[PDB]
Each structure stands twice: as structure tokens, then as C-alpha cells.
Amino acid sequence: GMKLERVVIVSRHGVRAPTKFTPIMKNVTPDQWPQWDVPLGWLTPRGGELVSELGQYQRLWFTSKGLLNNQTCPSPGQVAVIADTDQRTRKTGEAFLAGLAPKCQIQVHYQKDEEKNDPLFNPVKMGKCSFNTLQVCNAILERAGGNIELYTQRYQSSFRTLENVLNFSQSETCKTTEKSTKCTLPEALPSELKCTPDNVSLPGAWSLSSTLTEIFLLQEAQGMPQVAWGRITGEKEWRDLLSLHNAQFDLLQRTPEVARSRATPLLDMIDTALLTNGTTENRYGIKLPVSLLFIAGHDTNLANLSGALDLNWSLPGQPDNTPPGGELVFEKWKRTSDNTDWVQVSFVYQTLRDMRDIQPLSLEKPAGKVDLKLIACEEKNSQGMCSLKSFSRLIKEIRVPECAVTE
Amino acid sequence: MKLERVVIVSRHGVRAPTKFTPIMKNVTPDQWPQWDVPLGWLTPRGGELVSELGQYQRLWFTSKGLLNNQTCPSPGQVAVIADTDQRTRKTGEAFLAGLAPKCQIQVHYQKKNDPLFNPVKMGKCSFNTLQVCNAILERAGGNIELYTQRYQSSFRTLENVLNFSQSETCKKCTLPEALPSELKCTPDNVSLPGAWSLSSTLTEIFLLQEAQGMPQVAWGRITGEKEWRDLLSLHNAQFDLLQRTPEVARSRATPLLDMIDTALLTNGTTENRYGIKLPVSLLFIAGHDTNLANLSGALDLNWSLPGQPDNTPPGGELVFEKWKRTSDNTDWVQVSFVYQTLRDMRDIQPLSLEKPAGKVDLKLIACEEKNSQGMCSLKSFSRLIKEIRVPECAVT
Ligand SMILES: [Cl-]
Ligand SMILES: [Cl-]
Ligand SMILES: [Cl-]
Ligand SMILES: [Cl-]
Ligand SMILES: [Cl-]
Ligand SMILES: [Cl-]
Ligand SMILES: [Cl-]
Ligand SMILES: [Cl-]
Ligand SMILES: [Cl-]
Ligand SMILES: [Cl-]
């Protein structure tokens, strides 16, 4: 019937320590933050272990569909891995192979100038690729309703939950302020968009909240004994908290005017990997095609791909829309009856509970999987898959030619 | 006329669909747009739309003297009850975000589970399955096929919106023919599995898509208010049979009827399940469309909402006002339905006394003593609830 011929996975790095630890973070709560023994922003051994569980699940799943032969190690030119220059992405590539193909010595490709940036993951740092600053800020602004304050009103109760979790009213930030209403984060730290030719940000209570709520998720996924000082009660409060993080990523990374430019190199790689019958990747030295191309990036990249392709989703049991180790999976299926090629898009992830418990993954106890819909495709299957040329042509429409990586 | 107490029973705000099934995929060749919150959960925008109703009510209740022109309400003036679902809890919070922003008023709920909103499902009482099914079948015109005949054009409009002809299900085909409907009554639930159940769910999905402000609503194939009305008549007709039929409605609405009664009649009691000290000036209750239908059926309240195709729309509020006549110190009850038009939901229209929310003036026919302007007497209102309530379904 339907045979799986090729897969491209764009994965967020696994569980990591917080990206920063600042005076503001310390002064928005009377409590002390739990410390992490790895440096800020690094993948933890537990983060690696959770990615290996996905690697293990994907080995079993790809083998059951015939993508990889049921042998000890995949054949030469079947599996290739690309990672961004950070330790977190590089060790996610390592960790994924430890699950997928342990003791096979498969290489993790990455740029060896480890000081500099890899444009596949961050093209707007190239000279050729810059944002039209007014167009981009205004586009994000109109997605927020015309003013950030209206976007803040939309998420009021979420900010109340974050404030309750931090015990914000009793922090140094609310020391001097006394009024009829509550001391609040948005009033203490008003948010306003900042757009430059190579970057977009929303500093204030919005950026801070995005960071803090992600830290709570990371604490939980890491298996830390005291998450958010024991003050998060059930999925409702988890999603109140992570709605702030998900909404900030929506504005800064899924807004088409930003996502199109930033997702272009990854879209070009995905397209090439699914289409060609013989090519040599020039920057890493990978002989495409391969049966499985695994790409280790960040949540920013998943959000850029989501916004560019117009993919919308929610992950059962996982409050972060772009969670640690979350995989956007592009599958090339061949219909046997006419040898026509079709593309299926999925999001493979672990629930927060399965991170917390380090749930062993298999075909019996599978990883979470959400079927994604590429609605803009012209030609579709009876089973919802985009045709190969419809998939490729959608990539042509959305891509920004100035943001291509021609090195 | 002095406004002294108010009870609001509200449907939760705009939410994602409650389910996503294979039949939903197979009745159209197109793909359904995905949502970015879990199935059945309130969207942030749904929360904002409810807060606009909270703002409107703050302005309206302040002008009428119920609440004081003040930053936050005084103790024991505003209380909130919500069902255990996230969508109702969030609706309570969103409502307070508009009524009393940053005042830290609590949303009460049981720590799907609360029998105030579902007394039959939780097992307080049960339906006599034959009596309920018979009452429904008589309202259907004898059977489900006869009811189908009364909504043929509506089914044709839905099939056109779905492009049903080119669907996996058809491979001349129609929804009622391809998916025959049959009534199912069990001790805790009634349903219409088949084309009726499906159509009731799909047409609500289109309304939620539109109210959510999605770019592609029903693949852009819902043309004119006439087609909106035709589509949601299927949704509304289901809720009429399955939720407004008195044999269903009176049982399911009993806990809410008792709460409304107690909130408007007492002089002082600490309510025993949520721990609310009644009376309050405003009691807000966050329920579902099924609850509004139950109350509507039990109280024999019929309404159509100008500009709003769903009779039990997102954020729709059944409002019970206790008015005092200062002439002879007589207490009177007034019933209204407050809501937002479908366009105002899509545009997120700021509400105020200048730009008011939709409002339908309702009248309780069955009460004995009545005002010149149709209000029931407080004593008669309590008597009416005593007559229509089903004691076995009390929570209490
Ligand atoms: Cl600290
Ligand atoms: Cl660790
Ligand atoms: Cl970039
Ligand atoms: Cl403040
Ligand atoms: Cl920032
Ligand atoms: Cl960001
Ligand atoms: Cl679909
Ligand atoms: Cl929203
Ligand atoms: Cl007051
Ligand atoms: Cl019930």
C-alpha cells in the first residue's frame, strides 16, 4: 500500500539548564532559584537520556515500517545528523544516535568554527538576510491586536498565575508599590517591541514570563524534587504558565514576516533531502539522499517552521508547544499502486509526565504523536498527505530567497 | 425600582472543539484547521471576549447601583462558581478580569465532576429512559426521520459547506441517508448518533472558528447570515430535543434552579458545598451550553438571538435580576439573556454603555403574581422553582 522511503526530523535540543540567571529573576520572587550543575543553557545528562528514548522509539518505529533494516547498525549513507554549534544541540545529536543506533559511531555534523554562528539555524545574522524592521515590528504588533497592552489584557489571568507561583507581591519588585489593586508584572515591567535588522524582541514582563515559565517546565522535565517551590497545581496552572511562553514565541518566531526569513535554510534542506535522487551537501559533506536526516536545533526553529508552514498544534500532556526534544517529522511515503510520492508531517514528543518519570519508550508505550495538517497544499491524499510537488511548491512560495545559505 | 441582587449562569467562552474523530475527516475532502489549545479548552481570545462582557456588566451594574463606583468590590458583594473544567474555571477568571481586574476575587469549584452542572451524569438521579425517549420522539414529530424532513434545507447547506459529494463517506448522497440517526437514551445521557450528532458538532465548530477569528472558516463556504442560521438550526434543534425537553431539562437544571432560588430568597446562609456566604450582590456561575438549554427548557424560556446563530452561544449569560419596588417594599424577579453577536466576537468589539452587548428581554409565563412590566414576584418565582424542580436531582 504505502511505503516509507525518507524522513527528515527537525528536533529541538533536549532538557537543558536555564539560558540565564539575572538580578530581575532574583528580585521578582522572595524565594531562591534551584541551581543547575551544568553551565547555563547546556544539555543535562538526563536531557540526553530523554532524547535517547525518542531515538530508541524512532529506531523501532522506522524499522517496523522498513525505513531502516532490522539489523545492528544502519547501512552507510542511510543516517545523517546535523547539529547547531551549541553543546545543547550537539549533545542532542549524540543522545539521539545513542538511542537510534548505539555503538554504530555515526557522525554528528556541525560547523567546526564553534565561536561563530551556523546560518542554517540563524540566517538573519547574514549580510544578505535582514528584516525590514518597520514591516516586521508592525506585523508582530498587529498580531498582538495593535498594541501589546491589549495582548497583555488577553493573558491577564495567566500573569496572575505566574505572580502567585513566584509570590510576586512579597518580592523586592513590589517592595515600594502599595495600591487598591495587586502589584502586577506587566505594570512593574511594561513590554514593548524592539526590532532591529537582525533581531526581534519583546522585553518586559512578556520576555521575563516566557523565560520563567520555561524554567519551571525545565525543572519538572529534569526531575527536580521542588519545581516552582511546589506551587504549580495540575495541568490548568501548567498551561496558564506556558501560555505566556507559547504566546511570546508565537509573536517573535511564528509571525510570517519573521518565520519566513528564519525558516528558509531549514525549509531548503528539508526540501532538497525529500526531493533529490543524488546530491552532496556542501557545508557539512553529507551525501544526500538518506533515509533519516536528523537535525538538532532549538525551539525558535520549530516555531519558525510552524509559522512559515502555517502549522498549528497543541500537544496532549505537554504544556510547551516547542518542548525539549520535540520533533517536527517530515515523512516521504510512496504509494505502491502508482509509485506517487507523498509527504506526511507529524510532531513527535514526550509528555511532561514521561519526561518527569523518564518513561521507557517502545511500540507498546509510544511517544506522543500529533498529526499535523499542511492545509495550503494543492494536491492531497485520501489519508491527508501532501503530494511531493505540492509540498515542494509550498516551500517555494513561503521561502525568502535572500535568506538562503549558499556556502 | 432598585436593583439589589443578580445571578448569572454563563456558558464558557470560545473554546477549541471537544473532539476530533475519523467521521469528521471522512465527511469532507478538505482538511479541518487545527487549534493551538487542547480540545475543549478556552482560547485566550475566548477569555478576552468574556472579559468584555465582564467590563460591560461592571459598567451596567455600577450605573444601576448594584455594585459601588469603586476600584474593587467590597467583601461579600461578588462571588464566582465554575464547573471543574478548565474552560469554565478560565471563564470565571476572564469574567473577573473584566468585572474586577486585579481584585483577586476567587473562582470557586470542586477540588466532568461537579454535580451542580451534571446531576444525572454524576449519579444523584437518573432518567426514566422510556419516558425521556418517548417525550423526545414526540417533540421530534414521532421519530428522527420526521425531524430530518423539517431541516432538509439545513442539511443541504451543510453538505455544500463540507463538499460532501467529493468525500470519502460518499465514495445522489446526503448526510441523513449516508449516516442514519437513531435516538439513544441511557440512565445518565441522551444522544442522536448519526447525521444529527455530527451536524450539531460540525456547525458549532464553524461558529467557534468564526468567533475565534480564524482566517479560513468552513473553507470559506458559509455565505450570508441565511446560511449561518440554516447551519446552526441543526445545532439548535439537537439541543432543543436533547436538552430543552422538560423530561430531561427539569432534572438536569434542578441544582442550578435551587442555587438561583437560594441566592435570591435568603437573608443569610453559608452555602455548604463551595463555602460562599450568601447573599452576594452578584453571583456568576460558569457552565456550559447544555446548562443554558436545561434552564431554558425547565423555565419555558424561548429566545432567538439577533446577530448570533447559536441560541446558547460562547459567553452567553442567562441573567436573573432581583428588583425592589420602593413604593410598597415588594421584591420582583426579571430574566434576561445577555450575549455578543457573532460579528462582535470575530471583531472583538469593545463593550460599554455606548456600544452595549446584545440583550433579549425574557418573561416567565408560569409564575402567579406579576408586575406591570412582566417581572415575577420573588415569592412566585420561588414557588415556580418548587413546582418544576426534581427533588432527587438536588445537590443540595
Ligand atoms: Cl536566587
Ligand atoms: Cl542530569
Ligand atoms: Cl536569525
Ligand atoms: Cl506594579
Ligand atoms: Cl528580551
Ligand atoms: Cl524569542
Ligand atoms: Cl482534517
Ligand atoms: Cl487565542
Ligand atoms: Cl461593591
Ligand atoms: Cl447531567
Numbering used by the authors:
A (entry chain B): 5 to 411
B (entry chain A): 6 to 116, 120 to 179, 186 to 410
Q: What wording appears in the published article?
A:
The structure with a disulfide bridge engineered between residues 141 and 199 was refined to 2.3 Å spacing with two independent protein monomers in the asymmetric unit. The engineered disulfide between residues 141 and 199 crosslinks an α-helix and a coiled loop of the α-helical domain and has well-defined electron density indicating a highly successful introduction of this new element into the phytase fold. The major domain on the right is composed of residues 6–28, 47–135 and 260–410 and is colored blue and grey. The rmsd in ∼380 equivalent Cα positions is 1.18 Å. The four disulfide bridges can be seen to be totally conserved. All the variants showed similar activity levels in the standard phytase assay and essentially identical pH profiles. Furthermore, very similar temperature dependencies of activity are observed at sub-denaturational temperatures while the high temperature activity drop associated with irreversible denaturation is shifted to higher temperatures as the number of disulfide bridges increases. These results suggest that, while the engineered crosslinks do enhance stability, they do not cause dramatic alterations in the native, functional structure of the enzyme, corroborated by the 3D-structure of one of the variants. Indeed, the effects of the engineered disulfides on thermal stability appear to be roughly additive; for instance adding the Tm enhancements (relative to wt) found for the single variants (2.2, 6.3 and 1.3°C for S1, S2 and S3, respectively), ΔTm values of 8.5, 7.6 and 9.8°C are predicted for D1, D2 and T, while the experimental Tm enhancements relative to wt for these variants are 9.8 (D1), 8.2 (D2) and 12.1°C (T).
We here use rational computation-based procedures to design stabilizing disulfide bridges in the phytase from Citrobacter braakii, a biotechnologically important enzyme currently used in RONOZYME HiPhos (DSM Nutritional Products, Basel, Switzerland). At its backbone is a mainly parallel β-sheet, surrounded by α-helices and loops. The second domain, primarily α-helical, is composed of two insertions (residues 39–46 and 136–259) in the first domain and is seen on the left of the Figure in red/yellow.
